Amino acid sequence: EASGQDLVPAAVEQAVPIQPVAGAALAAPAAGQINQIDPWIFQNFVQCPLGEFSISPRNTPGEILFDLALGPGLNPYLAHLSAMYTGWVGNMEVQLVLAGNAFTAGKVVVALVPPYFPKGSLTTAQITCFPHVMCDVRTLEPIQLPLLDVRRVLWHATQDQEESMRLVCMLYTPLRTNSPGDESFVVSGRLLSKPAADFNFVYLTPPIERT
Amino acid sequence: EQAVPIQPVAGAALAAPAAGQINQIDPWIFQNFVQCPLGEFSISPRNTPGEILFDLALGPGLNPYLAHLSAMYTGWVGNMEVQLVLAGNAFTAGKVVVALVPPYFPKGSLTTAQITCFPHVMCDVRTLEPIQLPLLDVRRVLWHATQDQEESMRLVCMLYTPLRTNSPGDESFVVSGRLLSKPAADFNFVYLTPPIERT
Amino acid sequence: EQAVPIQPVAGAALAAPAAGQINQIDPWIFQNFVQCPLGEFSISPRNTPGEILFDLALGPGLNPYLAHLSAMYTGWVGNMEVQLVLAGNAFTAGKVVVALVPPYFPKGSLTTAQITCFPHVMCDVRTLEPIQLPLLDVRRVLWHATQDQEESMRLVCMLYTPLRTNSPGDESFVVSGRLLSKPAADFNFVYLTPPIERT
Amino acid sequence: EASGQDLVPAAVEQAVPIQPVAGAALAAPAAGQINQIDPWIFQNFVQCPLGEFSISPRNTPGEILFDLALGPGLNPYLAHLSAMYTGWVGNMEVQLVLAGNAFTAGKVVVALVPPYFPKGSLTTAQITCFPHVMCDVRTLEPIQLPLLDVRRVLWHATQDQEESMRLVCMLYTPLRTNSPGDESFVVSGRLLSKPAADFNFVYLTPPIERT
Amino acid sequence: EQAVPIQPVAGAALAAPAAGQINQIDPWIFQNFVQCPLGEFSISPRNTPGEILFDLALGPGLNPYLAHLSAMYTGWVGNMEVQLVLAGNAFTAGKVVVALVPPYFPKGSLTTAQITCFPHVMCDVRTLEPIQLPLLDVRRVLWHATQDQEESMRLVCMLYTPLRTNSPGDESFVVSGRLLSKPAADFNFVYLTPPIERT
């Protein structure tokens, strides 16, 4: 309602307890070609294809706000390029935009659930067991956070049936508002992404039409 | 906030060898932001995201003084500098994205996702200071001719994240925005020409 | 804010001479605050002060990884480190006191006055940062045995000063709090032991 | 309603115009024993026995919010110890907690009325005549302030019929709120205390049951 | 006797760049040989040579402590170290061969001749000291995932040369053997993970 700093600009990146992860440097000597994507793609963030979501005051703590897996399907550019190659390596950088109204309150948690972890429940009791961050729905700045390619093999086939370290944001505390009149501000959260330092594809293929 | 993934666009240093003259502007014009003819909008709490708040292309028509001077020359070339102002108190919430579409782009609808793929900036409705950003003259020709509007770089302003405010019984508290512009450092006209009456 | 009238409690340096081994923990476990099993509450504007928001004793059961490791050892000893998070905007008012009761105390009701007599901290509901504080292992024995829950130091969280906020027609705007914990620098297990099936 | 600094964190201790006052150092050569209380009691503040009060928007300027006299009856620890001795000396330190909602407004005044002053009226016209402080009901930090033992004799008998420099907080301006909806936040104020540098008792006695 | 035609297999130094973490083990676990779940047999004078005395693959299931820890992580990688003990006096005769089959091998019968073609050791039944030998983690992937048993290197123990002893009227004097194991120097788990209940 105003430009004040009665919000929590918690752009602080709490040190996520995880080592760096090597990207395309591990798959280079195993790809028959030399491939490289447009450097300008590494420059600006861009909304993930499924990058929109919303938190309502009737959402229950534990509901999965989103759960998206690492892969080329997180950038429109990368998704478009993935139709030309067969395989991809590397990490990703994701910004979360949660700039709800100052009359709101509530907290969510974002976790880097590793591969091979059984999908499904991921209850609120165990969401904090993973390397995670606690975010307030009133944060001004976009929250940056990495998406590393914790993998068992050299690269993942561009047909992404593989297991990748998915990133899951879950509602931790109920969303409540504080304004005196007949309205609870549902907060609209967005998700931007861009490839990490050495994200890369491997082997050129005919750019299939119906990807 | 003036950090967009763009290269510096040369203007009036690329059109000099093929222009008869390179005419200058009253330097006072470089020191006053003037309201662009259609750079204004007003967001309402019921405005759905994805709407186009404003859309306007680079050219001497964005500035009344520049439009008046254009009637006296043959061609023009160079960049401009714009700034957006938003009227919102600290009790608001919502985002607006402003992108720089290239001067060759299939017109039509743009979803709230595509708008981020251009070199752009995202702006909260609680920003006090005017948001300044450049309007570069991307082109294939050397210098644009004044007497025919050809394709130029455009600013597009899309409602990114909807407005979240309270409002009294009246009148729903729109957040109004305006856009001002002025010539950049190297905006010049080309060839002095008798001003034809119907320009 | 981590200044409570308490002395540093020695752990795993006092139990070493009488322990067969002193087993260590995966250091990664020391670097992640995990949600305690019952460290959660939600204050309402009609919650009267003096209520117990949460109450929980020190032990390997406060951490899922520590609980899992406890099935592999005979005894444990050491301190832990906890932090409280509160979800409240700047338009709230009310205080919550968190005290460190010693590991021998007649259970029962505690008035809003007695709760301040323990080493404690008072916290407004408008605190952004997590409130960190230690959980020391005050004891009479050297190292606690894993297979029997004996008396340990407890954290008690009492609603000190009631909540003062507005609220829309729904749903009265509770202020929710959560409690996370992790092992301190000198939390160790004692004697490696085959994990019996029903632990 | 938010974590902003739209409040008055006036933890400033306006210089109360009063000299320091010697405590137990004056009664030591007149007590037959050597007595001393637990040092840990001097460490943390604790809510006074009668340390709770509340300000309502219907309270009138001039109403005595509280009026409490210096003595061992201001700490649960000191009150419990007072049953063992016969007499006490020394000063006290008192924190006042007035952290009302940001939509409130109003001011109170705290004064150190000396001994032998006639109890009763203490009208709003004269509350400022004493060494006093003006406090806003929206203060974040606890307001610290001393309670010196301005006395005529060496010590006061632990039966506190004596005259001690009582401390009196009175509502100075009416409490009004500013939020738009059908509610005036009554503010709950608290009072914590702890003994000063050389507060002390004198002579041990049988710890009477019904104190 | 720990000289088999094998190369040193790198573990946890090859899986580090692609693992989020590299978790360590209670060092005490490195200092106790524990009985493998099926590492036991008993040769009789009528046992024909060529029989499989035991056969067991590398993995965290060979050690109760390692099996318990596996429920807490995502992946594992590294080598192990095993030792065989035989109970035979000086009045016996007969040989037993222990081979290291690679982690990709058509299962089926193995004659007493093929068993020698692997990197192996031959052992008389009159050996007092435990026979120590490594179990390396030959693989194609970087680090094995804890929640799915994939192919790993196996130890196979075949009765090479039959037993030649006298025996009283009872009970024919079997020669019993047991197999113990423990983690090698660079056996690690990969990614700390909440222990799912049915692991």
UniProtKB/Swiss-Prot annotation, chains B, C, E:
Protein name: Capsid protein VP1
Included range, full protein: 27 to 225 of 541
Organism: Norovirus (isolate Mouse/NoV/United States/MNV1/2002/GV) (MNV-1)
Protein family per UniProt: Belongs to the caliciviridae capsid protein family.
Domain notes for this protein: The shell domain (S domain) contains elements essential for the formation of the icosahedron. The Protruding domain (P domain) is divided into sub-domains P1 and P2. P domain interacts in dimeric contacts that increase the stability of the capsid and form the protrusions on the virion. An hypervariable region in P2 is thought to play an important role in receptor binding and immune reactivity.
Function, in words: Capsid protein self assembles to form an icosahedral capsid with a T=3 symmetry, about 38 nm in diameter, and consisting of 180 capsid proteins. A smaller form of capsid with a diameter of 23 nm might be capsid proteins assembled as icosahedron with T=1 symmetry. The capsid encapsulates the genomic RNA and is decorated with VP2 proteins. Mediates virion attachment to the host cell receptor CD300LF.
Entry's localization field: Virion; Host cytoplasm
Domain of life, source organism: Viruses
Region: Shell domain, residue numbers: 1-198
Quaternary assembly: Homodimer. Homomultimer. Interacts with the minor capsid protein VP2. Interacts (via P2 subdomain) with host receptor CD300LF (via N-terminus); this interaction requires Mg(2+) and Ca(2+), and allows viral binding and entry into the host cell. Stochioimetry is 2:2. Bile acids interact with the P domain dimer interface and act as cofactors enhancing virus binding and infectivity. Interacts with host receptor CD300LD; this interaction allows viral binding and entry into the host cell.
